[PDB]
Design an enzyme around this catalytic site. Sequence first.
Site, PDB file in Angstrom:
ATOM      1  N   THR A 109       0.856  -1.195   0.000  1.00  0.00           N
ATOM      2  CA  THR A 109       0.000   0.000   0.000  1.00  0.00           C
ATOM      3  C   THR A 109       0.903   1.260   0.000  1.00  0.00           C
ATOM      4  O   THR A 109       0.410   2.317  -0.401  1.00  0.00           O
ATOM      5  CB  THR A 109      -1.071  -0.126   1.106  1.00  0.00           C
ATOM      6  N   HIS A 456      -7.512   3.438   6.124  1.00  0.00           N
ATOM      7  CA  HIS A 456      -6.589   3.061   7.214  1.00  0.00           C
ATOM      8  C   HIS A 456      -7.179   1.884   7.996  1.00  0.00           C
ATOM      9  O   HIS A 456      -7.148   1.905   9.204  1.00  0.00           O
ATOM     10  CB  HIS A 456      -6.286   4.251   8.089  1.00  0.00           C
ATOM     11  N   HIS A 494      -1.950   8.419  10.594  1.00  0.00           N
ATOM     12  CA  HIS A 494      -1.351   7.952   9.303  1.00  0.00           C
ATOM     13  C   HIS A 494      -0.400   6.812   9.640  1.00  0.00           C
ATOM     14  O   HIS A 494       0.715   7.023  10.124  1.00  0.00           O
ATOM     15  CB  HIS A 494      -0.713   9.140   8.578  1.00  0.00           C
TER      16      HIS A 494
HETATM   17  C1  LIG Z   1      -5.324   4.825  -1.103  1.00  0.00           C
HETATM   18  C2  LIG Z   1      -4.679   4.766   0.266  1.00  0.00           C
HETATM   19  C3  LIG Z   1      -4.037   5.873   0.793  1.00  0.00           C
HETATM   20  C4  LIG Z   1      -3.373   5.828   2.031  1.00  0.00           C
HETATM   21  N1  LIG Z   1      -2.662   6.928   2.434  1.00  0.00           N
HETATM   22  C5  LIG Z   1      -1.950   6.796   3.540  1.00  0.00           C
HETATM   23  C6  LIG Z   1      -1.085   7.867   3.928  1.00  0.00           C
HETATM   24  O1  LIG Z   1      -0.887   8.866   3.214  1.00  0.00           O
HETATM   25  N2  LIG Z   1      -0.274   7.645   5.020  1.00  0.00           N
HETATM   26  C7  LIG Z   1      -0.410   6.557   5.835  1.00  0.00           C
HETATM   27  O2  LIG Z   1       0.271   6.536   6.879  1.00  0.00           O
HETATM   28  N3  LIG Z   1      -1.285   5.552   5.545  1.00  0.00           N
HETATM   29  C8  LIG Z   1      -1.969   5.646   4.419  1.00  0.00           C
HETATM   30  N4  LIG Z   1      -2.771   4.603   4.033  1.00  0.00           N
HETATM   31  C9  LIG Z   1      -2.831   3.389   4.879  1.00  0.00           C
HETATM   32  C10 LIG Z   1      -1.537   2.602   4.921  1.00  0.00           C
HETATM   33  O3  LIG Z   1      -0.827   2.801   3.686  1.00  0.00           O
HETATM   34  C11 LIG Z   1      -1.854   1.118   5.130  1.00  0.00           C
HETATM   35  O4  LIG Z   1      -2.678   0.963   6.329  1.00  0.00           O
HETATM   36  C12 LIG Z   1      -0.612   0.215   5.267  1.00  0.00           C
HETATM   37  O5  LIG Z   1       0.299   0.459   4.183  1.00  0.00           O
HETATM   38  C13 LIG Z   1      -0.974  -1.253   5.305  1.00  0.00           C
HETATM   39  O6  LIG Z   1       0.217  -2.116   5.368  1.00  0.00           O
HETATM   40  P1  LIG Z   1       0.046  -3.706   5.370  1.00  0.00           P
HETATM   41  O7  LIG Z   1       1.459  -4.194   5.435  1.00  0.00           O
HETATM   42  O8  LIG Z   1      -0.950  -4.073   6.452  1.00  0.00           O
HETATM   43  O9  LIG Z   1      -0.587  -4.070   3.958  1.00  0.00           O
HETATM   44  P2  LIG Z   1      -0.039  -3.904   2.480  1.00  0.00           P
HETATM   45  O10 LIG Z   1       0.995  -2.818   2.484  1.00  0.00           O
HETATM   46  O11 LIG Z   1      -1.247  -3.724   1.600  1.00  0.00           O
HETATM   47  O12 LIG Z   1       0.709  -5.290   2.228  1.00  0.00           O
HETATM   48  C14 LIG Z   1       0.060  -6.528   1.930  1.00  0.00           C
HETATM   49  C15 LIG Z   1       0.748  -7.146   0.742  1.00  0.00           C
HETATM   50  O13 LIG Z   1       0.331  -8.536   0.697  1.00  0.00           O
HETATM   51  C16 LIG Z   1       0.055  -8.883  -0.654  1.00  0.00           C
HETATM   52  N5  LIG Z   1      -0.794 -10.062  -0.634  1.00  0.00           N
HETATM   53  C17 LIG Z   1      -2.079 -10.169  -0.117  1.00  0.00           C
HETATM   54  N6  LIG Z   1      -2.539 -11.398  -0.129  1.00  0.00           N
HETATM   55  C18 LIG Z   1      -1.488 -12.143  -0.634  1.00  0.00           C
HETATM   56  C19 LIG Z   1      -1.345 -13.522  -0.885  1.00  0.00           C
HETATM   57  N7  LIG Z   1      -2.280 -14.418  -0.605  1.00  0.00           N
HETATM   58  N8  LIG Z   1      -0.160 -13.948  -1.392  1.00  0.00           N
HETATM   59  C20 LIG Z   1       0.784 -13.036  -1.668  1.00  0.00           C
HETATM   60  N9  LIG Z   1       0.773 -11.711  -1.470  1.00  0.00           N
HETATM   61  C21 LIG Z   1      -0.411 -11.334  -0.946  1.00  0.00           C
HETATM   62  C22 LIG Z   1      -0.533  -7.613  -1.248  1.00  0.00           C
HETATM   63  O14 LIG Z   1      -0.525  -7.634  -2.669  1.00  0.00           O
HETATM   64  C23 LIG Z   1       0.343  -6.532  -0.600  1.00  0.00           C
HETATM   65  O15 LIG Z   1       1.447  -6.063  -1.369  1.00  0.00           O
HETATM   66  C24 LIG Z   1      -3.424   4.645   2.796  1.00  0.00           C
HETATM   67  C25 LIG Z   1      -4.156   3.567   2.291  1.00  0.00           C
HETATM   68  C26 LIG Z   1      -4.714   3.593   1.013  1.00  0.00           C
HETATM   69  C27 LIG Z   1      -5.417   2.373   0.474  1.00  0.00           C
HETATM   70  C1  LIG Z   2      -6.888  11.522  -2.813  1.00  0.00           C
HETATM   71  C2  LIG Z   2      -6.885  12.963  -2.311  1.00  0.00           C
HETATM   72  C3  LIG Z   2      -7.646  13.746  -3.365  1.00  0.00           C
HETATM   73  O1  LIG Z   2      -5.489  13.317  -2.218  1.00  0.00           O
HETATM   74  C4  LIG Z   2      -4.812  12.629  -1.176  1.00  0.00           C
HETATM   75  C5  LIG Z   2      -5.676  12.438   0.080  1.00  0.00           C
HETATM   76  C6  LIG Z   2      -5.020  11.993   1.270  1.00  0.00           C
HETATM   77  C7  LIG Z   2      -5.710  11.801   2.464  1.00  0.00           C
HETATM   78  C8  LIG Z   2      -4.837  11.259   3.601  1.00  0.00           C
HETATM   79  O2  LIG Z   2      -5.010  11.751   4.871  1.00  0.00           O
HETATM   80  C9  LIG Z   2      -7.082  12.035   2.458  1.00  0.00           C
HETATM   81  C10 LIG Z   2      -7.706  12.444   1.278  1.00  0.00           C
HETATM   82  C11 LIG Z   2      -6.971  12.652   0.071  1.00  0.00           C
HETATM   83  O3  LIG Z   2      -7.592  13.103  -1.093  1.00  0.00           O
END
Ligand SMILES: Cc1cc2nc3c(=O)[nH]c(=O)nc-3n(C[C@H](O)[C@H](O)[C@H](O)COP(=O)(O)OP(=O)(O)OC[C@H]3O[C@@H](n4cnc5c(N)ncnc54)[C@H](O)[C@@H]3O)c2cc1C
Ligand SMILES: CC1(C)OCc2cc(C=O)ccc2O1
EC number: 4.1.2.10
Length: 515
Positions: A109, A456, A494
């Site tokens: 992610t 999150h 975050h």
């Molecule tokens: C769009 C978005 C924006 C975000 N923005 C922020 C932000 O700006 N700052 C922040 O602090 N947090 C942010 N978050 C949240 C944060 O990034 C996540 O909570 C965090 O990265 C999750 O880490 P993880 O290791 O739990 O999962 P992930 O990082 O998703 O890791 C899981 C991995 O396992 C793999 N996988 C899953 N199932 C299998 C399987 N069966 N076999 C093999 N591989 C598999 C996946 O493909 C993936 O690469 C954001 C989340 C999203 C979705």
């Molecule tokens: C996708 C866009 C438009 O840009 C980035 C963004 C980041 C947060 C994270 O705190 C929340 C909303 C958001 O909006």
Amino acid sequence: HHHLANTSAHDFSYLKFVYNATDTSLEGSYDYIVIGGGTSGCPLAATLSEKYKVLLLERGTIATEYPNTLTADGFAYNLQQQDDGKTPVERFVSEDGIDNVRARILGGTTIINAGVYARANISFYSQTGIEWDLDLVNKTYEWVEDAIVVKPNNQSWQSVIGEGFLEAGILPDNGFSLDHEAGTRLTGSTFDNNGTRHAADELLNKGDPNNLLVAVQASVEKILFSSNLSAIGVIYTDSDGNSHQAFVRGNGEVIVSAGTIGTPQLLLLSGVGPESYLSSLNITVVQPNPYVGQFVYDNPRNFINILPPNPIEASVVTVLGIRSDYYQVSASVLPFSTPLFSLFPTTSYPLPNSTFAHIVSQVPGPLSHGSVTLNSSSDVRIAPNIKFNYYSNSTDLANCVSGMKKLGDLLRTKALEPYKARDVLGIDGFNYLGVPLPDDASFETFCLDNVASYWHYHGGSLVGKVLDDSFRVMGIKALRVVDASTFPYEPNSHPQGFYLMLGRYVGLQILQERS
Ligand SMILES: Cc1cc2nc3c(=O)[nH]c(=O)nc-3n(C[C@H](O)[C@H](O)[C@H](O)COP(=O)(O)OP(=O)(O)OC[C@H]3O[C@@H](n4cnc5c(N)ncnc54)[C@H](O)[C@@H]3O)c2cc1C
Ligand SMILES: CC1(C)OCc2cc(C=O)ccc2O1
Ligand SMILES: *[C@@H]1O[C@H](CO)[C@@H](O)[C@H](O)[C@H]1NC(C)=O
Ligand SMILES: *[C@@H]1O[C@H](CO)[C@@H](O)[C@H](O)[C@H]1NC(C)=O
Ligand SMILES: *[C@@H]1O[C@H](CO)[C@@H](O)[C@H](O)[C@H]1NC(C)=O
Ligand SMILES: *[C@@H]1O[C@H](CO)[C@@H](O)[C@H](O)[C@H]1NC(C)=O
Ligand SMILES: *[C@@H]1O[C@H](CO)[C@@H](O)[C@H](O)[C@H]1NC(C)=O
Ligand SMILES: *[C@@H]1O[C@H](CO)[C@@H](O)[C@H](O)[C@H]1NC(C)=O
């Protein structure tokens, strides 16, 4: 902050030890297998590889295949892009009806997120009751930050919002700080000052290239167990659909780092989970635990969108307004005709014709929870069902009320006054995309009706429910879980900072235990 990263290209040096899962020569024995090359998985695998032979298995491909993952400017593209099963963004809809995404890429992610970097609330550690090595936690934060975190440059909109938060009473002014504390600050970013994305994959560069192997497009389908119950290995399929086995040896271990969705899915598919649920699907129970896939949380995002009469400059989120009952930020966003999947909770939402400010508040905890259940009892590529039960707990709703009232205060600041379309006394002087802010009953309806995912989400394999204080799956030897499935509350606004740190921290705990 001497230690922070510089501007630099995204470092793909680690690709020298990344292989297609189609390579049968990867099959064999290792000291450690890490499932999921994500936020926690990459730094855990890199840490373990300092002393031991490690296989990291990632279901997605490499980020070089999706160049829009490598820049701040590319962020929207990845959410706009249709999910063909191969893309770095996997689209889903919770049973609540709220659109959402998870990563499917090496780096997890961190390759698709909004880049915001923070350390955990320093009170988080004693809240857990885990005996954390707090000095090692802090050194491990510096090891992540040294590699991938910068002090962001000035951005006009983030400065406006920062002045606004302070004017609205979100005090004190914490200046530039990585710490989750009450008040307004500039925090770190995993986007560098050139707009290059830095991510968990780059922490693989800290691995020992003689000890670490990565298989990509490796879909891990099952954890294999002994016949003293121990994890011994995995089955994984490749992009052609052929099957492969890898094993751990000696005092080695399997660690699941497949995320809030992927970890409970694979545990359930492997027969680790509630006896009556798995029996009901005719999945043989290896280890009964009533809590696998239980206590799954998604912190609510509530928001308004203002349309200033004069263009604003787009920004990455760097300026945070923190209280114990709400965490607030704003992005300034270019207009688009293709929606960013899950930015708004459904596909039926107006498109912006001009630059807008997305102004948001995050509910802490949250106290509402749901569950992950299998959609398929056999196929890991079929996404599990997920439900979060947004606002089923009235404390969450009360907290959204407080947050939405504070966003009201923010729109009334002198800071935001220049962004009104009409010089009238009230916040009806703004133009809004979608629903504007409205006694508490109208704030409650606004909270319930316009909730979106903060992205999150966490839980489903909790410390104290499925795991012990060392991240071991209770009742099973040689099996751990390290990722966002492990905690029922946020570490901070975050959480990527905490989960990057946690991967290496648990890797070091593993190496120490083994000494
Ligand atoms: C769009 C978005 C924006 C975000 N923005 C922020 C932000 O700006 N700052 C922040 O602090 N947090 C942010 N978050 C949240 C944060 O990034 C996540 O909570 C965090 O990265 C999750 O880490 P993880 O290791 O739990 O999962 P992930 O990082 O998703 O890791 C899981 C991995 O396992 C793999 N996988 C899953 N199932 C299998 C399987 N069966 N076999 C093999 N591989 C598999 C996946 O493909 C993936 O690469 C954001 C989340 C999203 C979705
Ligand atoms: C996708 C866009 C438009 O840009 C980035 C963004 C980041 C947060 C994270 O705190 C929340 C909303 C958001 O909006
Ligand atoms: C792996 O090899 C197959 C062909 O056998 C190919 O289709 C696939 O794209 C490759 N994946 C990667 C990540 O190289
Ligand atoms: C860890 O770092 C934080 C700042 O992030 C600081 O408040 C705290 O005192 C440090 N703890 C220890 C044990 O050094
Ligand atoms: C499980 O298998 C039994 C046969 O032993 C069958 O009666 C039952 O319907 C099966 N349940 C499912 C959900 O496959
Ligand atoms: C930090 O964490 C503790 C929960 O352990 C809490 O009492 C405090 O509200 C949190 N502070 C903020 C600003 O989130
Ligand atoms: C699988 O997914 C869909 C949601 O798209 C759902 O309607 C269907 O009932 C699910 N199957 C099971 C067994 O949960
Ligand atoms: C909300 O959360 C707590 C569990 O943390 C529980 O005590 C309380 O009863 C729940 N409230 C409601 C309204 O369900």
